[PDB]
Amino acid sequence: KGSVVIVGRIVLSGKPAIIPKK
């Protein structure tokens, strides 16, 4: 049987941030 794979993440430790322009 196959292994459970990590396909993505959810981060709770993030805080309001000004999105930077590139």
Place this chain on the structure above:
Amino acid sequence: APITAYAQQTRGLLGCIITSLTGRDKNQVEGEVQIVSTATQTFLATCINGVCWTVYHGAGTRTIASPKGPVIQMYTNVDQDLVGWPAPQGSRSLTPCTCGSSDLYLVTRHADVIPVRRRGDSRGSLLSPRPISYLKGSSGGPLLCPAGHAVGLFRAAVCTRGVAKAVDFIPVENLETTMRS
């Protein structure tokens, strides 16, 4: 501080299937909750105190893919519907709730946090019913308290007519008991 969350997809269908058979995942890890998948389904896994916990009904008895190959489960409790593997190098752990609050917030696989009021020790009522399709793929996710501490792991919805009015969760106390077994 307000509980906010965001999601990020790390791999696709073909990459996921290959990594499943291989059992070797070299991707970098970040976050407290991992979006996890099998060939059958996709659900969530929450890292709490150095251990990555998920739902037994989703992971079964499988290993988790890692840089070093498959990693065997540390804890397995069919009766409590739990499994645990050591938290992946890179993940960040949540910590058990101490304050004993009754105002919980469920974090879904789409990174939405919804308020739920604790009723029983394993039940809580959504303050805003949503179709079950909204909650789909969220079992194994966290039920946080206003302080951001793990109160339980989402496992099933109490729904009717296709609308979830309440949720069934696994309180963190069963994790202690599971580890102690």
